[PDB]
Design a protein around this ligand. Sequence first.
Ligand code: SF4
Ligand code: SF4
Ligand code: SF4
Ligand code: SF4
Lengths: 167, 171, 167, 171
Amino acid sequence: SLDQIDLLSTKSFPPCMRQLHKALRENHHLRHGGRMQYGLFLKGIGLTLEQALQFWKQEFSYNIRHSFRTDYTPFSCLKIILSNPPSQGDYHGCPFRHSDPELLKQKLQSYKISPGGISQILDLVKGTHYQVACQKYFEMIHNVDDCGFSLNHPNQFFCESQRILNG
Amino acid sequence: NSSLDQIDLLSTKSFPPCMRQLHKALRENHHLRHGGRMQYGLFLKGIGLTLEQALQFWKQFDKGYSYNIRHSFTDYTPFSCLKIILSNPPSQGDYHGCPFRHSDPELLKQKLQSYKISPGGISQILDLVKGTHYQVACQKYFEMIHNVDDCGFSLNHPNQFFCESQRILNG
Amino acid sequence: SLDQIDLLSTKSFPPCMRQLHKALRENHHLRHGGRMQYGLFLKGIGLTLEQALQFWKQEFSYNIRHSFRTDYTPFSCLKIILSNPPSQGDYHGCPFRHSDPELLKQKLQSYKISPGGISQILDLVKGTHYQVACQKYFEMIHNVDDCGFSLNHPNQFFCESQRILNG
Amino acid sequence: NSSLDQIDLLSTKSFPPCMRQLHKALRENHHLRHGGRMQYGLFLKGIGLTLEQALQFWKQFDKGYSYNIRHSFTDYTPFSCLKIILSNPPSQGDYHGCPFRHSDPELLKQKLQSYKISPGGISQILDLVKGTHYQVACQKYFEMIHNVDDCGFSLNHPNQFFCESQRILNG
Ligand code: SF4
Ligand code: SF4
Ligand code: SF4
Ligand code: SF4
């Protein structure tokens, strides 16, 4: 079930995907924009997001499984940041770009980022350096001084996080 | 959960024509209407496998479904031959039913040819179908497929066909 | 893990395989004859029996999983009955053929077969009708008057049992 | 648990030569000696996959092992390039190590040819190897495989190679 990756989402998902996992868990649904952003990200980690149905019910809960018709290429940071701004009721997008800075601050606080770390991230967001802000977030949650890569894809954030957590 | 392609070979070797066609249609179309989900899903249930229908995240002509199977270890009962033959005839969107009963003989002939049944076997099957001896035609199919002279049982259930097929294949 | 099929073994395994599952569970090992008889039977139901190792341990617990080099053709009743009589320390074979009738009676009692049912089975065993005794056992545990098949393979016993249990 | 063949394609696309060869040897031989289980198993660990070694029931030249992978969600650390290059040189039974460092140049040439690297690419790789520039040779391999002029990073870890490869493939 979807809840098997709650811990993983907090430890290794970038903020854009962490928020989608939380929303799906809390709302029991995501609109298409969110299903696409999060579903493709999961596909990039080797997981298929799907809704379980009952075959014996006539037409006329979300699950994850190892993957066993469509373009499964996961969205990059620039695709997320520059296109499809979320409307109310959407949970997709990049929080560094799309969240009100006051809300972003509160979100980072809930993520247990230090006040000093939050100040650095917000400074970067104000300069429109969204991916660099995200690198700073990465550095904070993994307790490393320098992430040592140039971030431009959510699946790269995940991949680099896994290297540290499984270090 | 596992992919449906995991039983492609099993279907050809041991599924009777009614279930063989449903597996094929599910694989090619990525979906079956309710009559087929019931007939095929409950047949799998009888073997001890649960079919699961799921909706893929990307769906907003591809209905966006993915099916999987797993070992089972609501109260619906797997269909007998008589239930399949005598009730729920398939409409145009449907792939269920019994091919010996429900397929036009010209199309049935073509299907048996695609299964590589001998001309002599096909002739015997079609003559049995002409007499409305559907289950006996299916026994002939069983015999042709397993290369035995006598299936050794009286066919009354797709799940019986499966068990008897596996018993031969298992020696 | 192996324990996931404890219930299945009691409900659908013929006595020859039920005893091997129990022995493997209790002894944490089976000699080769038992590993072969039981392992091939499981393969016939679409399961792979294997022992989990630790890759990081230098060389110089049993698991079951869906199957993903050797002949995997499962043993028939006659192969089991007529060959490889079990020595002490072996748990393979066919209990109708290989168990002392006093022990077979006790085993059937533990399986909750009625006294009348046990008498019928033992009569058949004395006549050397091992497979027919097994059919009678099948009829008793599934509460049917006539099994409606001619038994000659343990995997056929399982297949026919599944039809009833999932009926 | 899932079959190792599930990452055959992934290995060719995104595994550096050191891990690519270990995956191939594991698939063909159905086993690796300890140095290879460590190097490849820990590389997979770094990706977030746990390799499992198991002994098949039938084992009493086929050692009787079966390997599987699953998502990981003892304290051994995945090997860096320097660890692979400078320590634990492979003996004759071993498939571990760094091919740029450990393969005889004639055999390395043959291996790169089997990978369908251009003659020009192979020449450049071999010249780098001649200078003992193993990681820079591996960067050249990365560039040839992904059709980019500059890998854009300084290679120091097989798991870094993997992440950078996937980032390109993911756009
Ligand atoms: S910078 Fe990229 S990875 Fe980070 S939250 Fe934004 S879109 Fe996601
Ligand atoms: S005779 Fe019975 S088992 Fe054979 S195809 Fe028809 S319904 Fe299926
Ligand atoms: S008769 Fe056959 S299926 Fe029954 S216990 Fe003996 S060997 Fe097993
Ligand atoms: S240079 Fe590093 S990543 Fe490349 S093959 Fe050698 S050890 Fe592996």
